[PDB]
Enzyme design. Structure first.
Site, PDB file in Angstrom:
ATOM      1  N   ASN B  23       1.188 -11.278  10.078  1.00  0.00           N
ATOM      2  CA  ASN B  23      -0.278 -13.022  11.117  1.00  0.00           C
ATOM      3  C   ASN B  23       0.672 -14.293  11.680  1.00  0.00           C
ATOM      4  O   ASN B  23       0.938 -14.801  11.218  1.00  0.00           O
ATOM      5  CB  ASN B  23      -0.578 -13.695   9.476  1.00  0.00           C
ATOM      6  CG  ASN B  23      -0.968 -12.345   8.668  1.00  0.00           C
ATOM      7  OD1 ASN B  23      -2.208 -11.781   9.379  1.00  0.00           O
ATOM      8  ND2 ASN B  23      -1.246 -11.994   7.234  1.00  0.00           N
ATOM      9  N   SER B  56       6.840 -11.791   4.269  1.00  0.00           N
ATOM     10  CA  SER B  56       6.678 -12.421   3.824  1.00  0.00           C
ATOM     11  C   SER B  56       7.902 -11.737   2.291  1.00  0.00           C
ATOM     12  O   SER B  56       8.425 -12.823   2.232  1.00  0.00           O
ATOM     13  CB  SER B  56       5.351 -13.299   2.588  1.00  0.00           C
ATOM     14  OG  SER B  56       5.120 -13.625   4.013  1.00  0.00           O
ATOM     15  N   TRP B  57       7.367 -10.635   2.265  1.00  0.00           N
ATOM     16  CA  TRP B  57       9.126  -9.940   1.129  1.00  0.00           C
ATOM     17  C   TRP B  57      10.403 -10.040   1.925  1.00  0.00           C
ATOM     18  O   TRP B  57      10.872 -10.315   0.009  1.00  0.00           O
ATOM     19  CB  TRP B  57       9.096  -8.318   1.474  1.00  0.00           C
ATOM     20  CG  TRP B  57       9.297  -7.455   0.836  1.00  0.00           C
ATOM     21  CD1 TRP B  57      10.235  -7.158   1.444  1.00  0.00           C
ATOM     22  CD2 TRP B  57       9.224  -7.172  -0.307  1.00  0.00           C
ATOM     23  NE1 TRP B  57      11.254  -6.007  -0.467  1.00  0.00           N
ATOM     24  CE2 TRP B  57       9.994  -6.301  -1.359  1.00  0.00           C
ATOM     25  CE3 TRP B  57       8.210  -7.920  -1.575  1.00  0.00           C
ATOM     26  CZ2 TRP B  57      10.212  -6.491  -2.428  1.00  0.00           C
ATOM     27  CZ3 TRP B  57       8.877  -6.844  -3.025  1.00  0.00           C
ATOM     28  CH2 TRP B  57       9.437  -6.247  -3.465  1.00  0.00           C
ATOM     29  N   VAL B  80       2.942 -16.689   5.772  1.00  0.00           N
ATOM     30  CA  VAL B  80       1.092 -16.595   6.078  1.00  0.00           C
ATOM     31  C   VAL B  80       0.586 -14.866   4.602  1.00  0.00           C
ATOM     32  O   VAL B  80       1.031 -13.709   6.106  1.00  0.00           O
ATOM     33  CB  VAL B  80       0.258 -16.454   6.962  1.00  0.00           C
ATOM     34  CG1 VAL B  80      -0.980 -15.886   7.087  1.00  0.00           C
ATOM     35  CG2 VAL B  80       0.797 -18.131   7.473  1.00  0.00           C
ATOM     36  N   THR B  86      -6.080  -3.495  -1.164  1.00  0.00           N
ATOM     37  CA  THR B  86      -5.110  -3.619  -2.518  1.00  0.00           C
ATOM     38  C   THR B  86      -4.925  -4.480  -2.431  1.00  0.00           C
ATOM     39  O   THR B  86      -4.789  -5.649  -2.766  1.00  0.00           O
ATOM     40  CB  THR B  86      -4.357  -2.470  -1.729  1.00  0.00           C
ATOM     41  OG1 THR B  86      -3.538  -2.985  -0.806  1.00  0.00           O
ATOM     42  CG2 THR B  86      -4.569  -0.888  -0.406  1.00  0.00           C
ATOM     43  N   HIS B  88      -1.548  -4.645  -2.679  1.00  0.00           N
ATOM     44  CA  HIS B  88      -0.453  -5.530  -2.286  1.00  0.00           C
ATOM     45  C   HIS B  88      -0.495  -6.856  -1.811  1.00  0.00           C
ATOM     46  O   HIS B  88       1.092  -6.900  -2.058  1.00  0.00           O
ATOM     47  CB  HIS B  88      -0.249  -4.490  -1.177  1.00  0.00           C
ATOM     48  CG  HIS B  88       0.535  -4.262  -0.634  1.00  0.00           C
ATOM     49  ND1 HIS B  88       1.687  -4.442   0.461  1.00  0.00           N
ATOM     50  CD2 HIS B  88       1.761  -3.177  -1.059  1.00  0.00           C
ATOM     51  CE1 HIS B  88       2.951  -3.400   1.341  1.00  0.00           C
ATOM     52  NE2 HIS B  88       2.938  -3.162   0.314  1.00  0.00           N
TER      53      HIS B  88
HETATM   54  O1  RDL Z   1       3.768 -11.526   5.531  1.00  0.00           O
HETATM   55  C1  RDL Z   1       2.992 -10.808   4.981  1.00  0.00           C
HETATM   56  N1  RDL Z   1       1.643 -11.479   4.487  1.00  0.00           N
HETATM   57  C2  RDL Z   1       1.193 -10.579   4.865  1.00  0.00           C
HETATM   58  O2  RDL Z   1      -0.256 -10.336   4.286  1.00  0.00           O
HETATM   59  C3  RDL Z   1       1.486  -8.906   3.793  1.00  0.00           C
HETATM   60  N2  RDL Z   1       0.194  -8.430   4.465  1.00  0.00           N
HETATM   61  C4  RDL Z   1       1.350  -6.329   4.044  1.00  0.00           C
HETATM   62  O3  RDL Z   1       0.135  -5.466   3.448  1.00  0.00           O
HETATM   63  C5  RDL Z   1       2.500  -6.169   4.307  1.00  0.00           C
HETATM   64  O4  RDL Z   1       2.738  -5.917   3.853  1.00  0.00           O
HETATM   65  N3  RDL Z   1       3.015  -7.772   4.496  1.00  0.00           N
HETATM   66  C6  RDL Z   1       4.517  -7.479   4.797  1.00  0.00           C
HETATM   67  C7  RDL Z   1       5.861  -7.230   3.739  1.00  0.00           C
HETATM   68  O5  RDL Z   1       5.903  -8.352   3.725  1.00  0.00           O
HETATM   69  C8  RDL Z   1       6.365  -7.071   4.094  1.00  0.00           C
HETATM   70  O6  RDL Z   1       7.360  -6.865   6.039  1.00  0.00           O
HETATM   71  C9  RDL Z   1       6.584  -4.814   4.275  1.00  0.00           C
HETATM   72  O7  RDL Z   1       6.334  -4.635   2.934  1.00  0.00           O
HETATM   73  C10 RDL Z   1       8.208  -4.409   5.311  1.00  0.00           C
HETATM   74  O8  RDL Z   1       8.636  -4.635   2.858  1.00  0.00           O
HETATM   75  C11 RDL Z   1       2.648  -8.706   4.475  1.00  0.00           C
HETATM   76  N4  RDL Z   1       2.965  -9.855   4.896  1.00  0.00           N
END
Ligand code: RDL
Ligand code: RDL
Ligand code: RDL
Ligand code: RDL
Ligand code: RDL
Ligand code: RDL
Lengths: 154, 154, 154, 154, 154, 154, 154
Positions: B23, B56-57, B80, B86, B88
């Site tokens: 994002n 973000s992770w 963001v 899902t 997630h």
């Molecule tokens: O910063 C993120 N914002 C999101 O909305 C979002 N949505 C998702 O489905 C998503 O997989 N991510 C990525 C996540 O933060 C990780 O980079 C990813 O899982 C790999 O570790 C993010 N990351």
């Protein structure tokens, strides 16, 4: 049976208050309540340490510093969270509550919870010195009790 | 009454910013806001360390490295999250918030929360430099205050 | 301003992959994606360690062993959770996510999140090499970036 | 590529089972399944240690004692939670799952999850040796695999 | 097979009870139930230590002090949470449950859960010595069993 | 390109605040916000001149007197208008806004707009130190910026 | 400005409590609350005089006798009225309230109001030591404050 309890007289007790600035028009009422509770229960105002922080998110790290002081008997956490359009509220409320609770256990010192977590502004107002009392006053009274309890329990 | 607070002048303060790339069209506005807030409050741009991560992770583990630096006074976490189809989003938002909060306590150093956790894209846009402000600017301002507070509190 | 970031070339990098067997017809596609991402970014297949475990629940304890290896630069967690009739999904998803995030912080090493947490089978299929990409590929790409970042940050 | 996995033959493996008594008419079926899985995969019944506790709440503290034993290769947690009228179920399920997961990481030893978390009695019955299998059998099979994996991974 | 279990006779056992004051008209019934359970199972009233605290929030820090006593075999946590208009209940219930569970694992000592977490007042009354039993009595019985179990397991 | 902007440090700056008394329970919160913004940005309280007037209608004529002072760098207008049953609100809001804007141009001096113009009481409360911030703080921050800008622009 | 107020420490204070028997399962909780409030604020139990009467109707005449005692500093009236099918409740509630208020003025001595006047049984339970607190505790706290106030005011 051995029975341990805390009285509500606050002579000699020393308190830390951490109060956030977000929603200050309501937090400031909670702070007034906490201080009044302490003073009219016999605590000296001079023996209160007040720490201000930007938002609820920042309360735990400041509370951790106060709770580590040997001359602080209990910490009272004061803030006002009101749900917005996004889940931002949930994540902040979750971590502020987890942090304070964890710190209390880690430091073996009472940290009381005067943080409003409201769905609406009206609910926050109700709990900040109107029809549902003053959560600052309540968290202070708890801290008085806990500090007195800990004089025998800790 | 002992009162501790942080002013909002940032002269001499050193900040770490951890910003995710997911994002990015929105995160990049948050980063602009954070840097502008620091610089116009008197912080030097040379005293900012910016770390980019995928999502973000990944913010917490990077923030942990920056917060451990003795020459970093506070860390600002910027990302963001926007809810997808899902759950997630929930699991990532939960862990990024928990991680940052935990690190702040473990390291006794302010780490501020400029991570948008939106249900919709419109909500994210609102909070990334439009009608509901700029969450990067807000998290930076908080970090300024907390770093100044910590100069006396820590 | 000091700026730290990771490039996406994977020459010399060494990865651990922990992949669960529950929902293997989908997990296996995620594993294919993670390996392809690594190899075609310049990583050697010989420098991947793959650990198989029964279910998502078991991913963290295995990831903890891999992340502790000095010759592993990052760990990629791969699994597929699909909501059933009961809240079982919620409790497993919560703990797998918490565990991985906590390990990353404890071990100061990137652990990326390639675990699908879907409400429906269709959503899982979408994210396992069909219309919404391949979450294994995405988690691998993140791990490449983080490992490169950590060469200067850690 | 280095590949680590666990086979399903249980010769020589030693297991701890912690089983709660609440909802015993169902838990007892799960325990039967776990034991049968171990024995018919080649594990000796003499090498199983069974610990009974009142409820799911009490499973973690007992599992912590078993997992600490050097002669226990893996622990299988067995219980049955069924949602009642209040959120009591949620708080117990959350903590039992968190506790077990945390202990596994802390002690670097597999602890598998054979705890049913059902909304309804029918759902619990389905998962305790009827139409949706036997969660005790499943958790035991996982523990066999993990113990074997750990012989090379740990 | 090695089998470990706790009997329900409480001769020689020593218990800590932490009971909150909020909703005391119900908590007091839980306390009566816990004490009666202990005494009529053969425990001496003189061997009970009762600690009173303001609210459920304060139970964990007090339980932590009791559980650390070498002459306390188990701790029974007693309180009554009833959902109000805001999510305040959720944050308190979450942290009281987390805290108690974490302390039990940290101190390797049984801490049982006699905290009602009700959506309604009627549900609380049901569980405080009326149609759905007495949760204090149940948590005490669990503590008896766990203390006996630990005499061989710990 | 020539670029002119104002920083947010308020050292040496001198401010006039005109605040109306109608709806004082809310205006007083706006005044608190304005003063706090000035002081914590480095302005001296002694360098604030506060003028009180009956209602929003009277703000412009007083602001005109303050803005004419050579030792006032910017004026901050603070008031709270809430729509009643008649169009009275519209005529007052129109003229207070027109007056302030006109004065600023006539006197070539920044006059900022911290006047709430709300349809409802709830909206006013939101903007007077609760969920939508504090308009006094915002108008003060603007005045700081404008005064600094004018040091080079005017 | 001359300011008179009462602190909340009850050392040396002497209280009369008049408590009715109608609805005793609830009144008895109010009495417990009042006594606890007095004792834990530092009042001696020996300095409490408790008078029991049949119903709320009879509270005033008994309160009149206690309030006339020179060694009673304040009187706390405790009872529980719950609306029945007829207006009987209204006439009793009206006269008990009028009587107590009139006696307080006639005798120039604080008489506090811990009489529940509920439309429903649920409402009475809420106010007798459950979700809406304990009206006996509240009336006692008021009496403490008023007795202290009167030490300077009377
Ligand atoms: O910063 C993120 N914002 C999101 O909305 C979002 N949505 C998702 O489905 C998503 O997989 N991510 C990525 C996540 O933060 C990780 O980079 C990813 O899982 C790999 O570790 C993010 N990351
Ligand atoms: O105390 C707060 N109450 C709230 O309702 C609230 N809502 C928000 O959207 C919000 O961002 N905050 C601020 C938050 O506590 C932090 O200060 C901010 O995230 C910077 O770290 C708060 N803070
Ligand atoms: O990876 C998984 N995905 C799922 O959707 C899922 N659903 C389930 O109902 C389930 O029990 N599991 C298995 C779980 O991860 C464990 O292997 C199992 O509980 C034994 O410990 C999984 N595991
Ligand atoms: O294993 C359990 N399954 C349940 O569904 C359930 N439900 C309940 O309402 C409940 O109280 N328990 C008991 C709980 O696990 C503890 O034994 C009890 O709280 C005493 O500590 C259990 N325990
Ligand atoms: O035990 C409690 N049960 C409740 O239902 C309840 N509800 C509330 O709104 C509430 O604030 N509390 C009090 C809480 O436990 C603390 O004592 C208080 O927050 C001060 O730290 C309690 N406490
Ligand atoms: O500041 C004000 N806010 C209001 O909402 C409001 N509403 C009114 O109906 C109203 O008459 N006033 C007062 C007005 O500003 C003037 O003081 C008044 O007209 C006398 O000149 C105000 N003034």
């Amino acid at each position: 049976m051995q029975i341990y309890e805390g009285k509500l007289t606050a002579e000699g007790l020393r308190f830390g208050i951490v109060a956030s600035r977000f929603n200050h028009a309501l937090v400031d009422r909670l702070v007034e309540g906490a201080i009044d509770c302490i003073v009219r229960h016999g605590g000296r105002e001079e023996d209160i340490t007040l720490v201000r922080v930007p938002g609820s998110w920042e309360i735990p790290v400041a509370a951790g510093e106060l709770a580590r002081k040997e001359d602080i008997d209990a910490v009272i956490a004061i803030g006002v969270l009101i749900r917005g359009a996004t889940p931002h509220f949930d994540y902040i409320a979750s971590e502020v509550s987890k942090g304070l609770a964890n710190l209390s256990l880690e430091l073996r010192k009472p940290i009381t919870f005067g943080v409003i977590t409201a769905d609406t502004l009206e609910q926050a107002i109700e709990r900040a010195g109107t029809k549902h009392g003053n959560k600052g006053w309540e968290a202070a009274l708890s801290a008085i009790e806990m500090a007195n309890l800990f004089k025998s329990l800790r």
